[PDB]
From Swiss-Prot:
O2 binds at H64. Monomeric heme protein which primary function is to store oxygen and facilitate its diffusion within muscle tissues. Reversibly binds oxygen through a pentacoordinated heme iron and enables its timely and efficient release as needed during periods of heightened demand. Depending on the oxidative conditions of tissues and cells, and in addition to its ability to bind oxygen, it also has a nitrite reductase activity whereby it regulates the production of bioactive nitric oxide. This is Myoglobin. One of its GO terms (molecular function) is peroxidase activity. The modification Phosphothreonine is found at T67. SUPFAM superfamilies: Globin-like. The keyword Secreted does not apply. The gene is MB. It catalyses: Fe(III)-heme b-[protein] + nitric oxide + H2O = Fe(II)-heme b-[protein] + nitrite + 2 H(+); H2O2 + AH2 = A + 2 H2O. It is an enzyme of class 1 (oxidoreductase). Heme b binds at H93.
Amino acid sequence: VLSEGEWQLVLHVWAKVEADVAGHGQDILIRLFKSHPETLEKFDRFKHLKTEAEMKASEDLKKHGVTVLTALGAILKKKGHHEAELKPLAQSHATKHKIPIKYLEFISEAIIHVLHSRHPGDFGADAQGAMNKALELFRKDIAAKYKELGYQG
Ligand code: HEM
């Protein structure tokens, strides 16, 4: 469980992410799709994109970046009390999208890389540790829902 001091670090940087959700979304999806190409194959709507330049040019990709970050933001601001927000997400990602838990680990690492690139001053090692802990909590709760449904990972 994160302390109140650790949640503050998390939400202090997230308030900067929120100044430009779309640019953040874009960087994070592209980082993920380049680092772990197998993730790109889950998206019929993106599968055609072959280069980084094509990814950067895609308005639909940018739109879906905002979608993801806005959902994640709603969860982070619950400070761990995120039952109502998490449930629908695990359900669709386990059963409809077929997303292994391992990919949620990949996208976590993309989020931490981009926050460190864009926000060094607010994202020192103490902030990075807090954000890793929040993302682990997110992953741990989703994984429990997966298990229930028979999809664990
Ligand atoms: C930070 C974690 C993630 C969050 C907050 C998240 C959130 C969302 C949201 C809110 C939607 C739209 C509503 C829905 O269908 O449930 C969505 C759709 C989807 N997500 Fe995620 N997602 C996450 C991770 C991922 C990852 C890691 C992948 C694939 C590697 C994935 C695959 C998908 C797919 C295939 C769709 C449907 C897109 C479409 O065709 O419209 N998601 N996600």
